[model samples]
Target: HMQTKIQKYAGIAMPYPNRTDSMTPFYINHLGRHGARFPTSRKALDKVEKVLVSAQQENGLTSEGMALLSMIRRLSRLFDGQWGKLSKLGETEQEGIAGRMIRNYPQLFSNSAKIEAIATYVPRSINSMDAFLSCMIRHNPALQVQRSEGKQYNHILRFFDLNKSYVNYKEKGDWLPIYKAFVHKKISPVPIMKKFLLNPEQYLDKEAEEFVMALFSVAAILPDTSIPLNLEDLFTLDEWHRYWQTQNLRQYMSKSSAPVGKMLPVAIAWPLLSEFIRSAQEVISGKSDYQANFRFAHAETVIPFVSLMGIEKTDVQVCRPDSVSVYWKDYEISPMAANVQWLFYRDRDQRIWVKILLNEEAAALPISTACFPYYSWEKTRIFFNQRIEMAKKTLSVFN
Candidate 1:
């Protein structure tokens, strides 16, 4: 009943066929930041700073055109930190804030060229990010790492962590962490992508696995991050030296495959290592199951029922409402009558049909045969870790 007023006050919410229907710790991040586990901090923030900072050139802009490719992103309520709800600020507040910042920090920003450059549709600060990231890439020479702009950020970070291991023996030195910091940045970072908009139809049909692999592809292709390293890349005090033999079979057997012999070890084992990376994603995400969909089950159905049940509702006519709306349905029923078995059964049945169709479509979908070897496990670990962080990002709000 308490949750029911959102739409009544905010107005009717358009049905979102793509949204998760159930609400729980599995989808805790879906509820709000307080429910997930992003662990936003100076540490995460610092890592972001280091990468973006490196990307900056003296012009206070990155040569790579990363002025605002995208911004670090997570559900707004789930990852926006404390005070997710600011009654004082309206939806356009981000724009308003950006306007004030440009006026407030003229030195940091470019001379108004970017003021209008950041469109309302995009969420970058014409002044702040323009000024900040512009300076970052030039100096850092590392890849960008903000959550809103997942593409570039994911690329840079993966390089910092993976390349060290991928090119261990030949890697001259470990400078990423120090390298990341030399420009005055730090270790762990806060973590988006935009620009390449996945059209609505494709996005709706995308599998969680597809989403993760896309992240890996972006990370793998980055120029700064692409080079194989030498012995010097390690920082012993940090014990990051494991890149030499951290864990892949490819790490061995090459020993200078010359004209290209130097890359032989990795060339051979890369495929095997990548396979594990992808499989790992399957385990972490666990596909679309009961666990990732709901919050409180035994008590009342206050949360959602996204499992196969929720997806089926996409095909539902009469448009089943979101969790907030469903809560209203319960309110219409007596509070004492909330958990009637028959009602839940009816709704559950509806959700199943929606998801089964969704899964079937998803099943026919291609697994990224493209990653071939190393990309899969690499991307999967990244996805699962992010999901964990996303889940934690939810509960973090309350904490």
Candidate 2:
């Protein structure tokens, strides 16, 4: 057998993204494993690693890389195409397959997935557990990306909101500080679990808000330090206090409307998270390559919750392989973006992790929308717009 040597390279194509387009050199120049490759071609690899009656399905190589891969097709074709199924493989069989590949085609072991052509699939339905699992498997690229992005953003948001704790947590700080910041006890055995229930950040709705942020986050457009606002700026601290004073009573004080009886509540904390979405859209669009995002679906009113929340991140008119979409799965317990990642259409995990923008290095971790021109940060517009409507309905702006 030839010595094991996996020489790898990645090349891209022009008319890129367009199957019809001629390819150029790989956009990113490096080689690594399929899942963690420099350019991340997990989606592309899975597309090529399919089972069938025979290989050599395609008659000609469209490019140099496909030419090399064509050998696998030919070999599989010679084997009547059933050579690569999981059902047919035991440990010894897998090892034999690898050994034979090493002996005859040492070059094939190298990873060149970034620009290599591969087959992909789209399931028409999800009727069984395996089908669902397969669907998730096909969408794994997006899922992995989302999971990473979510962790990044969630930490950033938390850091921005509670820098003291998050920063300490980063530098060997224990959970004690975080516990103090978030929890409260009122001389009860239960300790109330008050912080969790009354968490200020909860207003942001991790799942929904992270979905909103991921577009710009993925694109690396949001959370520019050049811009004036930091993560803290996204909140609605003052309005939130007013809201508490007039709306939520019996908790802060017994008399909700006692005009002068007690000391006033301090409004130092970040504003309500609802305000941040508006700000994100505005900041993303006006300044960066991030542009207007139109949330979409097969239906007209794609995101029904848009009525309560702000507009969904806008989408481009042209359809491409990796479309970062934030669609709600009504069937899901909380809900997921259901994003269709670029080339990774086959990986069952289709959505990239939601937050990576606010703080790529943050701990709470969220999916970010650093990629959007979806909207600029327009907290005033959204807050006032919604607040005014609410006031008109209830006839109260401040307590």
Candidate 3:
């Protein structure tokens, strides 16, 4: 949700439905981020308001800054003290994406098809899946969607949370140094800082930090709403770009494969990716009973899983010049409803084929394929099974 909102802040959304064509979306095994959400905590909003309040006391804020402060005051109310719940825009995002899927591949939503839906039991994630399935069921009431979550499923649906090494890796915050260096070198937090402080220097570190997060929080929350406020209207395009890169850098370290000497991100994702291959194998063997699988999760799942799949150049070196040119930008990989989908196909020759889409774009696969986007399912299954075995070894280290 944060990444999508950020892209919209940077002007990348709208005029939707530009997608790669496919044989058919035969069976969907989808894992996606929930839609737009409020700041994950009440403290987040408080921090932003605290800075604004301090500036207000000093009468230092420009009229425009005052307007922004007022706008935030109003936006904060929509949260209703719900720390990280999905906003109406979140429901709409899932609904629209589901609607698009139905429209794009009507055959996939066959009333007779059995669909399985699961989420991490996080309110926002469940809400997203519910909204999406509601749309699908509305179109075809016989969709027969089954849903599950909670402790029993977390190992597969929310593996990062269950894996100790992954949890430790996240807590370590190893990327802070690199991210801080990038912030100091590329982004001067002063542009927005000056808006909310009497002594921008004295409070620069605190207020500037709050301002960047406020910008991201607003980016995450507001776009899914009717309200309109542009950070660009406050910061220059250059400043916004710097802010954007800082976020990308942060997400890179936290979610993507930026941390040094850590296999947790990719390895911890084994059970889930293994599930994908196992289901595909079942379908190939004509033993699969279900027609679709939808798993709604966080960027934590999406990034590592993408890394495990080695798509989107996600296998790139963690940092490059300024940490900006790296292949794993959050906007692309972890956007609201950011999903990885596999569409299975079978030809007249009875040969099976598979295609992978990352955020609806044809993703580069890790291995050379016997064919292009439609690779031989035999080869694809073999590739995944091999990796799954290695992932087993990697996951064992945590024990």
Candidate 4:
């Protein structure tokens, strides 16, 4: 169920909602997550194989175990072959998003428009940048776009330092115990276990059962895949929900609600956030060079950066286990090609106002904007600066 949702193209776009007769959109700043790809490797799948193969040798596998083994083998072959490369579907995701952006604000791509693009050094992110760039260039062949990246931008994208305190906290984290308890209490692996083994007893206590299920759960969403498995049949819908509960909780701690996540965005992203303000300033002050700015990065940067912006329920703390899903969901918040966009509009009088978009939908700014989708730059800047100062002090204590 979750897989199909994740694989769906997030072709999200809503027209400029706050368009006033006096205002025209002039600039767009965007930050996007990389597209979908195969798993990092066969490590997780191999663990599935080891248990299944051993069971087969012992004449222990039921019919369902044999089917699962076959599916795991095929998945291993595919994932191992294309370990970390982006999927074809990923290319289309970026390209389609670029096309939508162009259509949404056709005026932003005029011949004289200055376009600046930066991407993280990671291949998935760089490839996403390339995909988006190809579409932009197609819309305006002569557009001069400046591209920059490498170690230099790392400070802006990855602003936070290695957090020892948070690291130690996770080392002593209660997540493992909580997850195990949930699996036991909520998921009766007995049904699936009997299907996999002649005697479910041996494997019932092993974590491999849970791990393989997760691997398939994620794999089910890959855009184009031939691996044979009706993942829904493997786990009931309620059971799958429980699985995602843990996975979602894991992400909340790592990227949304963790101590580092709280500090990392504002403290480390101040430089990047400030650039956003400066770019708007440049246009407002009549010294602007660029019409559009884009940054392509990993989920690591996209999630925390938006967390700082206080959009998408990210501002809420996942205090209790049950509250994790209530606040955030992995597919909605961190799926392939996720992004945050700010479209800046200027009126006849040169007053700057901005509309914020999350995954292409008009999103409300955390602070009170002058109006929905129309935030006065003056108040917006002051609100963010204050937030940045508070984040800096938070980082000081963490350090």
Q: Which candidate should be chosen as best, given TM-score against the real structure? A: 3
Candidate 2 wrong stretches, greater than 4 Å:
1-43, 51-54, 57-399
* Model 2: lDDT to the true structure: 0.21
| Model 4 pairs in collision | 159-268
| Per-model tally of clashing residue pairs | 96, 84, 0, 1
Clashes of 4: 1
Tell me each candidate's TM-score. Answer: 0.17, 0.17, 0.87, 0.85
Task: Report every candidate's CA lDDT.
Answer: 0.23, 0.21, 0.70, 0.66
Query: Which of the predicted structures, 2 or 3, would earn the higher lDDT when compared with the native?
Result: 3
Q: Model 3: which residue pairs collide?
A: none
lDDT tens readout by residue for model 4, 1-399: 554533321111111111211244888888887766656556666777887888899998888889888977876766766766767767877888888887777777876678899987778778888998999998898888998766566766654434555455445554556655654655555565676778776654546456445544444443323234444456555555655665666666655554434444334555667777777778667787788889887666766677777664765675566666776765555667788888888878877788887777777666776468788878878877776777677768766
Over the stretch 238-301, how does candidate 1's per-residue lDDT look in tens digits? 2221111111101111111111122322222222223223432333456422211111111011
Sort by lDDT, best first: 3, 4, 1, 2
User: How does model 2 score by TM-score?
Assistant: 0.17
Clash count, candidate 3: 0
Candidate 3, 282-334: lDDT as tens digits: 76567977778888877777877887777747756554636444455666666
Question: Model 3: runs farther than 4 Å from truth?
Answer: 1-22, 195-199, 202-207, 225-232, 259-261, 319-321, 395-399
Which candidate comes out best when scored by lDDT?
A: 3
